[PDB]
From Swiss-Prot, chain C:
The chain holds residues 152 to 188 of 528 of the full protein. The modification Phosphothreonine is found at residue 6. The HDAg-like domain is essential for transcriptional repression, and mediates the interaction with the RNA polymerase II complex. Ubiquitous. Expressed in heart, brain, placenta, liver, skeletal muscle, kidney and pancreas. Expressed at lower level in adult lung. Expressed in fetal brain, lung, liver and kidney. It is found in: Nucleus. The NELF complex is composed of NELFA, NELFB, NELFCD (isoform NELF-C or isoform NELF-D) and NELFE; NELFA and NELFCD form a stable subcomplex that binds to the N-terminus of NELFB. In vitro, the NELFA:NELFCD subcomplex binds to ssDNA and ssRNA in a sequence- and structure-dependent manner. Interacts with the RNA polymerase II complex when it is not phosphorylated by P-TEFb. This is Negative elongation factor A. It comes from the Eukaryota. Disulfide bonds: none annotated. Essential component of the NELF complex, a complex that negatively regulates the elongation of transcription by RNA polymerase II. The NELF complex, which acts via an association with the DSIF complex and causes transcriptional pausing, is counteracted by the P-TEFb kinase complex. (Microbial infection) The NELF complex is involved in HIV-1 latency possibly involving recruitment of PCF11 to paused RNA polymerase II.
From Swiss-Prot, chain D:
It comes from the Eukaryota. This is DNA-directed RNA polymerase II subunit RPB9. It is found in: Nucleus, Nucleolus. Belongs to the archaeal RpoM/eukaryotic RPA12/RPB9/RPC11 RNA polymerase family.
From Swiss-Prot, chain G:
The gene is NELFCD. This is Negative elongation factor C/D. Disulfide bonds: none annotated. Essential component of the NELF complex, a complex that negatively regulates the elongation of transcription by RNA polymerase II. The NELF complex, which acts via an association with the DSIF complex and causes transcriptional pausing, is counteracted by the P-TEFb kinase complex. Widely expressed. Expressed in heart, brain, lung, placenta, liver, skeletal and cardiac muscle, adrenal, thyroid, kidney and pancreas. It comes from the Eukaryota.
Length: 195, 144, 37, 114, 130, 49, 177, 49
């Protein structure tokens, strides 16, 4: 379906071009297969992010990565890649509004689910390759807020920093007040506990 | 035997209150930290403007890295000395370090004032991402 | 108190002045740049 | 040095000398087609290789969200405030920490260094 | 540091700036005017080209900063090259006072003819010790 | 030798089920591309570098 | 306010005010003692300096404070530095001798050259002394005095490395026996 | 046709696509030789599955 979308749009196939224009265009890869080139990559990236946030043609595990310095767009829909959710930020503002949280509070007897937040394009899955092309915000309450700006272009914001922890390391109270070898020791030992 | 049986009468501990310094001490530590941050910013903008000149037998990156390294080192040492000055006579950390039975002055400076610079291979944290240590920072940043 | 002062015993002619005056000029124009801020 | 292919079979033209006229002739091989060469120099390589990074700068980097943006260096073609500044950070490098600036205005990719 | 300079292994690659195989079949009128001025000063003495000289020019320009750093003069480098290659390389050097430190190499009068100069420069860049 | 170093560094490819490597232009010739300009057009997307 | 601010990075900005205030001699003495306590502290050197230019201004203005600045500089010339690289220490001492030459330009030649001859014959590297005499021979011009050659000539035979040098040898040999 | 670049294809006319892919591979090899693009890291987790 991604290739169908590209054929619908102005994606120039390799066999259908002279080589000379390749330097004046951006290469397009699909799971490591060069399919062709494109002239205005920014428009294509905007459209692809729009469609993934709308889940029209693209399921929300396909990662799109635009390397400007090499003029390349790599798209991966294969298995084995690892991603995590991240909130989307535009105009230095969260797309997550209080009405979304209100809909979340009534989850039972409402049938509003996480998949609606995925469907509304407020939270999107990002993989480690695409993370390279992200200016991420730790916390929205200070970093996106106006200040003597460290950065003024934040695309994504983390839901909560504590989710970097592991399943058996998350049980540590105040893990950021301990020498990290002690955190590894506790992670090892908690699996050995009795209960 | 005799020292333990006396220690029952005396007793020894370690508490949160043993890890507290004066508000003046924290303020002085924070002033030193902001001073070091501003100095590192000065060195960064000097290197950016091609105003930092390399030392003999060292490239510009080596000169900049050594300068910022020693800035953080003496800032950490000054904060540690200030923390050591703030300790009481009843501070159990000082009891355990002066006796030498456990810990060190570096450990007290770590717990109370500044954990300090982390290192891999003897250098600061490398750019695992392209020109970035983590996504939360901007590209081509060399701050502490 | 001590009356007039004896000028320094001149031992030579300065065909060129030391570079500290050049450093003075550079530091002065940098001070002007700061005052511009 | 100007690199040129054969006009008959598109293989590399190799320089050669004619002892009669004493002029460089870009002669092909496996096709015996000859051409008048004029550079008087077959090969140059700068071992200094202090190349201008502005050749390798690409104006599209104005679109990146991760690069730091300065508002204190107006452009020279349009005077646009916001400019994206960064370090080239290639090989033949890691001794020049200079900042290369790209004008952030659309369709004005004026690039410079300071 | 002077003694230190006499210990660190120096080669042509470390001190050279760039190289160019200019064609120049006529030694009198060289293809580069910049070459031609001091060449008229130097080929004013027609020496080792009166019999014949190669029709290939190898013009190498060297960094002044490394030469001042390593205390070298162009004359001793020319003597080292001559010791390395005998008559095989006629080396004609510009006076060591110009902006660029230039040196021309041609082949012996008794003499590949063009790729052999690539062999010469590739061998001389690293293997030669100054 | 004195001539391989003269020309300079070369590029090879060690193919699967082929113990010995081969040069790249040989592989491009094997894919039916004889024009070296066409071969570089697959590699060097400009010709002003 | 400037010396007690200590946040100070504004020193480059306050330089004109610093010099006009230094025109008062007591202010110059205060700046001298402040610079002494500042630079004399350990680990002061993490900068590509400026306080030494303040000492240059102090020596330029008031001749009476000439013995004081030298008494500081020689102290800074004999202090040993550990965390500074040896080449960095050498360049630091070269800067200190540049300040010594600036002081010498103001007519305080004899005690400075006497200390130089002392620390030669009594330690320091010959390179720094060669650099100092090169700087002195840069700006010097004839004519001279008997005591000046008495202090400056006998140091001038222990080395033979470099033409103002041979010019001075000819002048002093002909005129100043 | 088969054992080299299977993911590109095995058809008769994807030989041109395979040629372009090989040209891109050696192009990036050239860029690493000139350092126009940096070297890749085996431990960069984006190269993992
Ligand atoms: Zn041809
Ligand atoms: Zn502009």
């Amino acid at each position: 379906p991604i290739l169908e979308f590209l054929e619908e749009w102005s994606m120039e196939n390799l066999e259908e071009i002279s080589p000379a224009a390749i330097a004046d265009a951006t290469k397009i890869f699909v799971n490591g297969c060069w399919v062709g080139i494109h002239k205005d990559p920014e428009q294509l990236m905007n459209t692809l992010r729009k469609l993934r946030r709308q889940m029209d043609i693209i399921v929300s595990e396909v990662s799109m990565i635009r390397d400007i310095r090499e003029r390349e767009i790599r798209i991966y829909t294969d298995a084995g890649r690892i991603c995590r959710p991240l909130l989307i930020v535009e105009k230095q503002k969260l797309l997550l509004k209080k009405r979304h949280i209100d809909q979340l509070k009534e989850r039972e007897y409402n049938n509003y689910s996480w998949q609606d937040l995925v469907a509304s394009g407020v939270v999107e899955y990002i993989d480690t390759l695409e993370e390279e092309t992200v200016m991420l915000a730790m916390t929205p309450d200070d970093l996106q807020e106006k200040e003597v700006a460290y950065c003024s272009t934040y695309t994504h914001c983390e839901i909560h920093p504590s989710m970097i922890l592991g399943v058996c390391a998350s049980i540590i109270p105040f893990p950021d007040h301990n020498q990290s070898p002690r955190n590894t020791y506790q992670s090892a030992m908690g699996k050995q506990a009795m209960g | 035997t005799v020292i333990n049986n006396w220690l029952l009468i005396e007793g020894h501990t370690i508490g949160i209150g043993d890890s507290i310094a004066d508000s003046k001490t924290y303020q002085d530590i924070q002033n030193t930290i902001k001073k070091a941050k501003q100095d590192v910013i000065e060195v960064i903008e000097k290197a950016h403007n091609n105003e930092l000149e390399p030392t003999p037998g060292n490239t510009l990156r080596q000169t900049f890295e050594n300068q910022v390294n020693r800035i953080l080192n003496d800032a950490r040492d000054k904060t540690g000395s200030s923390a050591q000055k703030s300790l009481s006579e009843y501070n159990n950390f000082k009891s355990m370090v002066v006796s030498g039975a456990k810990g060190s002055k570096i450990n007290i400076s770590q717990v109370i004032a500044v954990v300090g610079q982390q290192n891999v291979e003897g250098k600061r944290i490398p750019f695992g991402f392209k020109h970035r240590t983590l996504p939360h920072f901007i590209k081509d940043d060399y701050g502490p | 108190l001590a009356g007039p002062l004896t000028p320094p015993v001149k031992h030579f002619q300065l065909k060129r002045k030391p570079k500290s005056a050049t450093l003075r000029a550079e530091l002065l124009q940098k001070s002007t740049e700061t005052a511009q801020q | 040095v100007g690199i040129r292919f054969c006009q008959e079979c598109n293989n590399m033209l190799y320089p050669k000398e004619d002892k009669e006229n004493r002029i460089l002739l870009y002669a092909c091989r496996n096709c015996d087609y000859q051409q008048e060469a004029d550079n008087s120099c077959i090969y140059v390589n700068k071992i200094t290789h202090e190349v201008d990074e502005l050749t390798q700068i690409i104006a599209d980097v104005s679109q990146d969200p991760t690069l730091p943006r300065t508002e204190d260096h107006p452009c020279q073609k349009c005077g646009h405030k916001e400019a994206v500044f960064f370090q080239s950070h290639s090989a033949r490098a890691e001794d020049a920490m200079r900042l290369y600036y790209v004008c952030t205005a659309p369709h004005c990719g004026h690039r410079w260094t300071e | 540091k002077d003694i230190l300079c006499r210990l660190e292994h120096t080669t042509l690659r470390k001190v050279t700036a760039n190289t160019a195989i200019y064609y120049d079949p006529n030694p009198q009128s060289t293809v580069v005017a910049e070459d031609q001025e001091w060449v008229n000063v130097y080929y004013e003495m027609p020496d080792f080209d009166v019999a014949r000289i190669s029709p290939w020019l190898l013009r190498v320009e060297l960094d002044r900063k490394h030469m001042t750093d390593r205390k070298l003069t162009m004359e001793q480098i020319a003597e080292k090259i001559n010791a390395g290659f005998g008559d095989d390389l006629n080396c004609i050097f510009n006076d060591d006072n110009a902006e660029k430190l230039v040196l021309r190499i041609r082949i012996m009068n008794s003499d590949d003819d063009d790729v052999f100069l690539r062999c010469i420069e590739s061998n001389m860049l690293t293997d030669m010790t100054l | 030798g004195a001539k391989k170093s003269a020309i300079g560094q070369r590029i090879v490819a060690t193919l699967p089920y082929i113990k010995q490597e081969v040069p790249i232009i040989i592989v491009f010739r094997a894919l039916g591309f004889v024009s070296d300009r066409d071969i570089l057009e697959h590699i060097i997307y400009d010709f002003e570098d | 306010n400037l010396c007690c601010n200590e946040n100070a990075s504004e020193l480059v900005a306050e330089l004109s005010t610093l010099y006009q205030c230094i025109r008062f001699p007591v202010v110059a003495m205060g700046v001298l003692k402040w610079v002494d306590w500042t630079v004399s502290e350990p680990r002061y050197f993490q900068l590509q300096p400026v306080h030494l230019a303040l000492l240059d201004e102090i020596s330029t203005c008031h001749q009476l404070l000439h013995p004081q600045v030298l008494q500081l500089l020689v102290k800074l010339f004999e202090t040993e530095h550990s965390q500074l690289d040896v080449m960095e220490q050498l360049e630091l001492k070269k800067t200190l001798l540049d300040r010594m030459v600036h002081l010498l330009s103001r007519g305080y030649v004899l005690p400075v050259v006497s200390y130089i001859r002392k620390c030669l014959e009594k330690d320091t590297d010959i390179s720094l002394i060669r650099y100092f005499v090169t700087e002195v021979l840069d700006v010097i011009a004839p004519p001279y005095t008997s005591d000046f050659v008495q202090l400056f000539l006998p140091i001038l035979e222990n080395d033979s490395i470099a033409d103002p040098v041979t010019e001075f040898i000819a002048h002093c040999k002909s005129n100043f026996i | 046709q088969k054992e080299m670049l299977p993911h590109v294809g095995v058809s008769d006319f994807c030989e041109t696509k395979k040629a372009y892919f090989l040209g891109y591979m050696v192009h990036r090899l050239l860029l690493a030789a000139l350092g126009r693009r940096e070297l890749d890291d085996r431990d960069h987790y984006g190269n993992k599955r």
